[model samples]
Target: SNDIAIDLGTANTLIYQKGKGIVLNEPSVVALRNVGGRKVVHAVGIEAKQMLGRTPGHMEAIRPMRDGVIADFEVAEEMIKYFIRKVHNRKGFVNPKVIVCVPSGATAVERRAINDSCLNAGARRVGLIDEPMAAAIGAGLPIHEPTGSMVVDIGGGTTEVAVLSLSGIVYSRSVRVGGDKMDEAIISYMRRHHNLLIGETTAERIKKEIGTARAPEGLSIDVKGRDLMQGVPREVRISEKQAADALAEPVGQIVEAVKVALEATPPELASDIADKGIMLTGGGALLRGLDAEIRDHTGLPVTVADDPLSCVALGCGKVLE
Candidate 1:
């Protein structure tokens, strides 16, 4: 009666209780503290991520998963247990069935790590769903019909591009590029162009604030960081042009992936996509002008989903029914 759906992305994790809709959303992060010759978990989720790039010597904050699979097994397990306990409200015993969404391209080993983690976390049962499949349903696409539906979910660590029809995926491609990589690009751009070294969190702020995929106005922001040459903290002025150029690599990868999906589509479904176009979901869909960029590259009408971040989580809940 208290089953839950978990959308476990490399960057973020969201939870949806069967009848209650989504009730928990947090970064897949944890903070470890060193004390008495042992490393112990200090924080999990948003609280711990907030400490990223700004923690003290005795503490370190890191993401459990980097690109696709879980990077730190024990850390990931601890994170899952913490969130499950937090969401199991009425206080006390919890043995809910857990459905977790994994990237369509993840292998059996990747899936096994997730499965074992859930079991250790006290889940009575576990089911796995493909990311694109869940995203299609979450975005309200008629994937159960004869017509083919395309879904491009740009998450933090990867982009899930797939052709869904009749409640199943026909062709799916997972691209290893997303918003987190965008941050790394932004950091590299600043270091090379202005000789200013910035942290991960700082780069993400700039990308989220002013990063544009296409034409951007003369937007400029003051960026503060350590001057690489002088080894002193300094600030530099950056423009919209700079942000776009820095993000071009990652944005181009996503566009190319979409093109690949289009070319590989079944001829019949190709025309179906030509008529209905492509749908974008996930955190990356929030980037300004991303849809326009993809539209320009593919010549297909691209639409970003409403509440992009919640699509997969909502899809899992719908699966519960």
Candidate 2:
């Protein structure tokens, strides 16, 4: 039987087949249209992503997964089923054993829900792995060894921090704040400071283009949004410093959690973390100077994992090896 791996993340879902790298990577969004007294799914993943918040009342978009758990079971099942079918399409006939990753803090009920979704999605067998552990492995941390390793996965839905030893998580924390929160931070900043209303996509673009967590000498980007005061379109030149300022609240919360994790770490592991540095993996890690900000705030070395966006997916994929 062929084996498949899935990183069923809150913001996106990625699929890896036995011999293939990553066959599918897309936002965890689905759009449905109601027409002719029937319900029809319009799109999934990238196509569905484009419809988010832009759909009319007759159609709506959904992100079935939220905060690293299944929020809308039916949509999740449908989305997963679609991916499974697509993966097997080229092969003609095959049912793959599946490996899915989830947050460390997920409850037993949540775990069961994830498993159920996998089965419903056409898996032959489903194995669950914790996100931090997969992220550690994906980032090439020496987790199977006796030495301690620390990993932080700042994803779209959650900020997962963990210390690993002997191939398992020793201590961890999951904060329901990640790239999505950062996006909200930028949106709120525009609303409060500029009396502007920005869409989610524009906020995310600002984050990608100019969002920073460090006060570098100088850099700026032009931003567009709707002026609340004028009730019209507007543009503003936003500085990197301002971007950092907008992200301060959420990023500070993440750092505070990291500090708390350190406070509880065994002295020896703490020393190991201090020596080897904390590794960050996920899309949020791409924010300019985030590693520096975390290191400066936490007084610990920080490293952004290579291919941060694909860390979890690659981790899940390599499991087939």
Candidate 3:
């Protein structure tokens, strides 16, 4: 029997095979075409994401996962089935036990949706793991020790802040602000300040290319979008400092999430965190200066995981071991 671990992220889904490590990683997007009053699957994952905001009439590109949970059950099921089949080489009669990771603050209902999605998609059995704990384990934190360890997992739709000691979370907080929110912030900022209307893809590109939480001197990029006023294509030059300014609110919320978790932690554990420093994980952790931003706000050492984007998936694999 094959066993796999899944990081069913809102932005991207990653599947890890027991012996093969990460076997598949792709965006969690699906494109559907309407025909004869029925919706037919057109594409899934990377190709589907490329169709987002560029699809013609009679077709829709959708992200079934939102805010770190399944927003559309049927689409999510189909997406999971596609992933499972892809990893199994599209063979039939393949039923694998799966370990799926979810946000720390995922409700009972959200957890059930994730569980149900997996089961419906050829999982013979399923286990659930908290996203923050998985990130900590993936980052090689001493989670089983008495000393406190802190980890901040900044994913697509949620930022998870957690403190662990002796194999348990001492305190954890999940904020609905991460990569997606940052992208939205940039989009809104461009529209408001520069009269430029950029799509989600472009916003994400700008963020990954030039977005920063702290100011950089004289770093700028040319951004292309539609001018809101004239409804025509336009290009504008934006500096890293401006992008950082646009991201300030969401970034501040992430930092505040960390502060709140720290404040709620016991003094003994807090002292341990002070000595051990904070660990950052997940895709959003790759954002420039995020660690420095958190460090400046909290005055604590912050270290990003060696492979932030794959941390949760790797940690889920560890759970299966």
Candidate 4:
């Protein structure tokens, strides 16, 4: 009851409490209004993200995330504070110990922001956990034993590699390419081939509806984008040919990240990896053909975490206990 965890992801933020499941989930978005010379908080969470697509000029909220780390430390602190207060909502109650789940490759700078801001939010203490360890633990993998355990956690901004033993051993290889990067690739590809300008979340829709892990053939979507040439908004029919290839490039980086972790694993850990396979988690792991690509290339069976996107939050929550 006195501990909590936050999965501060690029796309979303989730909070969890000790002995309870995740209590709140929301988009990691904030809308800052320019007030003369100062930037002030205007709207946050659902309203901030919902601000897009309507309006004479739309809300144009800021994400404050870059490659799995907080891009705007001040903005991020507000989100953390807001989420913490929203759930706790009482000043008289004791503060919970905060655990901020972080990308394995996160530097001390990123961790410091998360910690100090959480301290600002009234935490009793702050602890950190590598995201893949949380994902692996959340997926019910046998990580508490000396047996080698491997996990692949793909997030909105980063992909993390893991090798675990009961002795608290780890071999990490996290990369900056992930689901968001894949979306960026698609938008760029469209910009080049069709001269169409897609916004941040636009490519996301097209990706889920048509982007693939494998490749080739058939599936397509009429994605709307602003036509750069005519200054007109138009919908273009894009097939898997473009979307899948765009996706594959980033996924290949993820696969390669996975491979190197395999290469660096100890002899016994490698043996356990073959027997147990790898647990895949994160938003990027949801692509249709990714697991096969991993299994095919790695020569090991791959099982995607049942709740891939929530693995970090859920597992870290358990650690809160």
lDDT tens digits, residue span 6-63, model 2: 9987888888877877888888888889998777888888888888668897998888
Per-residue lDDT over 1-321 for candidate 3, one digit per residue giving the tens place of the 0 to 100 score: 368999999999999988788899999999999999999989999999999889899999999999999999999999999988888843445679899999989999999999998999889999999999999998899999999999999999899999999999888878999889999999999999899999999899889888898887557889899999899999999989899988999999998999999899899999998887899998888889999999988999999999999999989998887
Ranking by TM-score: 1, 3, 2, 4
Q: Is candidate 1 or candidate 3 better by lDDT?
A: 3
Worst 10 residues of 3 by lDDT: 86-95
lDDT, candidate 1, at 256: 96
Local error of candidate 2 at residue 263 (angstroms)? 1.0
Clashes of each: 0, 0, 0, 0
Which ranking of candidates, highest lDDT first? 3, 1, 2, 4
Using lDDT as the measure, the top candidate is 3
Task: Name the runs in model 3 displaced over 4 angstroms.
Answer: 89-94
Q: Is candidate 1 or candidate 2 better by TM-score?
A: 1
TM-score of each prediction: 0.98, 0.95, 0.97, 0.94
Q: Which ten residues in a row have the lowest lDDT in candidate 2?
A: 86-95
